[PDB]
């Protein structure tokens, strides 16, 4: 339930936050934040940012309280010199000794009740102000308080967004008055409760709403179905330990008067933050102004300016530069000659800084990319992956003229940089990852890959034979020759061979629907509809079409140029375009023949390297599973060791049947999957499929806890953070329909796996770029988690050292190398 950044302390019409679990949150995350001396400041940093985010909505005042539980030296350290003490480790109580003074300096009050827990204090102050006439809002991070949501009591946070009381009836479906019984059968972190079983794929995560009809665990009921009643009477003294969540009593003896804000002491406020090196982010209280009507200027000194350009087509390599401008101090610097203006500039700074550098490298000019507003908005919200969308949302427009577009890049920097300075996790991703990567992608598009012009023509007649054979197969059946592919003439054959049933909840009735997913469910019976869907997969390449590789070759260089977008994706990968090599059918005899066309120069060789099971390695690092890290530390196979601990057989007695069943779960865990989806891929039944997911969690305990931690930090957070700090704004994780919520959860635990795996590649490409310039090698492609280079034996060993030793992880990374003349000779 809600939360993302620490903070705390109620007051009428203001936030009602808690400061217990919010100190434990920022210690297990954002660990890469330290000073130049050697003082930790990874949790002390969340004070001047969170309380600032809430001050835009504002209210009256804020008070201050501490914890008083049995294990608290780390939690209640926010007032050690005041009152309160208990026992816990020595590594954290030194950091909170810096915030206790900054409390009374902003004009905030204080309160402390020793003996009673912090969770009991919030329940008392919520119901007391309701009777007086004040507006309150419960607010918390830990999954304990949500039952107190009623009239006049709302949901918000200084951390993130807003939720209503009707929004509680959406995903959950339960009422507030009975929400105390929700967490009494779930589990999650801090609460010891092991036992979910299964029965009907619901387990305990999707069963919750059925328990409302006759509780069973608390008062009445004797007999019922398994898993819904079997795990209550079996587990003794386990449910009697789960009542710590229910310990949120509203009847505690406390007076405390609600008063307004005090005078802020700004003389010492800035004195404490400078010793922490964060005394510069105090200029966030100002307002912003930006119009598209700017001034003009000629050519005198335009160093460090924001450029803008006009092209003939969206592809930089073939396009002609029609106009070029610059912006410094709110003035537009127009040019009479486009090709001459490229030599007067130091660096391409502004919108689409990568795409302009590619135009310069063709003419013979080394232009480096600097700052770009496209990458600034990408880190704050992944929905803004357009030069148009960043302008229209934040205040501005995107025209066809270069003079107005150059002046836009100056303003889109002023507004987005202010929001990025308060984010240290995104500044690391902008200085060390994004900006220097723009210099790498610019060279892969400018140089390109050489193709074998004698193979593509021969393949054009080879595949043509496979087409004519399957075309003659449908002509042999049904009798009369007709016009295929056309929806109007396909129904005429279905008139002769009657067989048209329903599909499901996926929208029907229209004319667009009779070309999307029609006949895809009918293949399980008739062979006539199978030789048209197997044909839909045999004849694709560039989906029916075949984009000519020898004709798309530049008349100047002689190589194919592929555009790599740095933003695009949601996870954090580099999506290609012209040609889109991101989605190629692998391990298939069709997609393997397309790679044979991609060769190197007359004396150069292709060195293709691929990340061997990185998506399974990252799963172990973010969880901390002692059994999953064990497989990689030794250097064994993951698909074999999983099936060993599940069935109870040794690693050598594992046959191809059990290794297959384990492979489907190891690839399914990336997006979660379900027992219904697992039953369709394998020959295993519905009731037997549930046991295969349980044996996976019995062998790997911390992995189950991680899914519960991501479901926590997702439905409540709004986004899903990675190891480095990437965002993913999705409010879909709290929906009414079963089809919208399930699709949202599938995207929750999919970004910290596929995104970090892509970020380790992004950070590797930056460190490998200086080493390629001296060795005489170059970078070419980036598909999925594979990097293709062109040099050969000396570079293969150097590239392996950079990719593996990119960041110190808990698991040992392994990369598979491959040297050859072509992409098929190198394989992975």
């Amino acid at each position: 339930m809600r939360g993302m950044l620490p903070l705390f302390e109620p007051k009428g019409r203001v936030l009602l936050v808690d400061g217990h679990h919010l100190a434990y949150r920022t210690f297990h995350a954002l660990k890469g934040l330290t000073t130049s001396r050697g003082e930790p400041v990874q949790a002390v940093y969340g004070f001047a940012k969170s309380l600032l985010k809430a001050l835009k909505e504002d209210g009256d005042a804020v008070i201050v309280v501490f914890d008083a539980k049995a294990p608290s030296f780390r939690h209640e350290a926010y007032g050690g010199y005041k009152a309160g003490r208990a026992p816990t480790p020595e590594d954290f109580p030194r950091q909170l000794a810096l915030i206790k003074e900054l409390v009374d300096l902003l004009g905030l009050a204080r309160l402390e009740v020793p003996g009673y827990e912090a969770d009991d204090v919030l329940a008392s102050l919520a119901k007391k102000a309701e009777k007086e006439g004040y507006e309150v809002r419960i607010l918390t991070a830990d999954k304990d308080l949500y039952q107190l949501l009623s009239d006049r009591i709302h949901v918000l946070h200084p951390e993130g967004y807003l939720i209503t009381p009707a929004w509680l009836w959406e995903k959950y479906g339960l009422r507030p008055d009975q929400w105390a019984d929700y967490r009494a059968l779930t589990g999650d972190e801090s609460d010891n409760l092991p036992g979910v079983k299964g029965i009907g794929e619901k387990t305990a995560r999707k069963l919750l709403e059925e328990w409302g009809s006759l509780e069973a665990l608390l008062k009445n009921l004797d007999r019922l179905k398994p898993a819904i009643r079997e795990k209550i009477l079996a587990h003794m003294d386990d449910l009697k330990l789960s009542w710590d969540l229910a310990k949120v009593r509203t009847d505690l003896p406390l007076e405390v008067d609600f008063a307004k804000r005090r005078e802020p002491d700004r003389e010492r406020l800035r004195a404490f933050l400078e010793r922490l090196e964060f005394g510069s982010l105090l200029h966030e209280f100002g307002l912003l102004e930006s119009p598209k009507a700017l001034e003009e200027a000629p050519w005198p000194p335009p160093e460090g300016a924001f450029v803008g350009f006009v092209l003939s087509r969206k592809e930089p390599m073939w396009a002609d530069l029609l106009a070029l401008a610059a912006a410094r101090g709110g003035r537009v610097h127009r040019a009479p000659e486009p090709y001459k203006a490229l030599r007067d500039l130091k660096e391409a700074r502004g919108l689409l800084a990568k795409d302009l550098s590619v135009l310069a490298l063709r003419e013979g000019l080394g232009l480096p990319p600097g700052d770009d507003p496209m990458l600034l908005a990408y880190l704050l919200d992944p929905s803004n992956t357009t030069p148009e969308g960043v302008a229209r949302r934040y205040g501005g427009e995107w025209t066809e003229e270069a003079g107005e577009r150059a002046a836009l890049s100056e303003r889109l920097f002023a507004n987005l940089w202010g929001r990025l300075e308060g984010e240290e996790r995104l500044l690391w991703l902008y200085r060390e990852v994004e900006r220097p990567l723009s210099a790498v992608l610019a060279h892969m598009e400018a140089t390109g890959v050489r193709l074998d012009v004698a193979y593509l023509r021969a393949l054009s007649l080879e595949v043509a034979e496979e087409i004519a054979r399957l075309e003659a197969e449908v002509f042999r059946l049904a009798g009369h020759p007709f016009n295929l592919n056309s929806r109007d003439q396909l129904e005429r054959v279905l008139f002769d061979e009657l067989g048209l049933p329903a599909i499901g909840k996926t929208e029907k009735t229209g004319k667009r629907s009779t070309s999307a997913a029609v006949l895809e469910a009918l293949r399980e019976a008739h062979p006539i509809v199978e030789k048209i869907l197997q044909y839909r997969e045999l004849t694709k390449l560039k989906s029916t079409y075949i984009d000519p590789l020898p004709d798309l070759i530049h008349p100047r260089t002689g190589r194919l140029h592929t555009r790599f977008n740095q933003t695009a994706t949601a996870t954090g990968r580099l999506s290609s375009s012209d040609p889109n090599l991101q989605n190629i059918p692998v391990r298939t005899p069709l997609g393997q023949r397309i790679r044979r066309a991609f060769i190197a120069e007359e004396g150069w060789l292709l060195v293709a390297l691929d990340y061997s099971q990185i998506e399974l390695r990252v799963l172990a690092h973010l969880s901390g599973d002692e059994n999953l890290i064990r497989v990689f530390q030794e250097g064994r196979d993951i698909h074999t060791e999983t099936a060993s601990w599940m069935f109870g057989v040794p690693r050598e007695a594992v046959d191809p049947l059990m290794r297959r069943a384990a492979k489907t779960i190891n690839f399914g865990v990336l997006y979660g999957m379900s027992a219904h989806r697992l039953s369709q891929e394998l020959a295993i039944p519905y009731e037997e499929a549930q046991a295969f997911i349980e044996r996976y969690f019995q062998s790997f305990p911390k992995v189950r806890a991680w899914i519960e931690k991501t479901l926590e930090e997702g439905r409540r957070r709004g986004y899903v953070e990675t190891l480095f700090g990437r965002r993913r704004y999705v409010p879909d994780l709290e929906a009414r329909v079963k089809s919208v919520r399930e699709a949202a959860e599938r995207m929750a635990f999919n970004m910290p796996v596929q995104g970090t795996a892509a970020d380790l590649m992004k950070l590797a490409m930056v460190k490998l770029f200086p080493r390629l310039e001296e060795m005489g090698a170059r970078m070419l492609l980036q598909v999925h988690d594979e990097l293709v280079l062109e040099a050969a034996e000396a570079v293969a060993r150097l590239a392996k050292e950079v990719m593996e030793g990119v960041y110190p992880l808990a698991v040992p990374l392994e990369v598979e190398v491959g040297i050859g003349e072509d992409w098929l000779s190198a394989k992975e």
Partner: antibody
Amino acid sequence: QESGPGLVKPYQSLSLSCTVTGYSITSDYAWNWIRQFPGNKLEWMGYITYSGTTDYNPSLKSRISITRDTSKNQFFLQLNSVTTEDTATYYCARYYYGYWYFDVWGQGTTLTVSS
Amino acid sequence: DIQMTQSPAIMSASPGEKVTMTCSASSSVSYMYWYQQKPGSSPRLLIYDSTNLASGVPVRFSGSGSGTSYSLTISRMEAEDAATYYCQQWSTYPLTFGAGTKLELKR
């Protein structure tokens, strides 16, 4: 299904929306926008990917705006300063990508700009 | 932006005849897209880049063209082939479609 107004006044802002069910706008596929009629000559307006937007519209980018609402599972369209120069009859197309091609195509809806 | 023009517009053919239509551009064009649309339906695929046939498509249909002009040629006509055809490209283009070759049936 194309939902919106049947009539619009000059120099105003247009608001359209194509609803989708079953396959969400977060799994895969890019959703395009293309018009036709009366001269039977078509024109592009751009697309909208599963991740966000990623669109790169034609020379007339100062008027067209593409946005979306993932919670309701639909994508909006906003054409500012709509005049009589607009041909009209909007279709909601879709790109596949990885391997590019147009297959499906929208309904139609005949909208006219008049006073 | 390049201009797409389909020659001709309206034309009719009897079942069994040889049909031919062309799509031309202003500059050096590489590869073409071909479509089909019946009265009261959505437009779909038919023939692809330069020559070969798509997912399905009868053996009587055939493509040709390289350079400035790309054409479609049908060897055997039937009563179900009468519809409107369109052309597009994605080489040196930000993608836009043609005029429309409305093919009708002769009786």
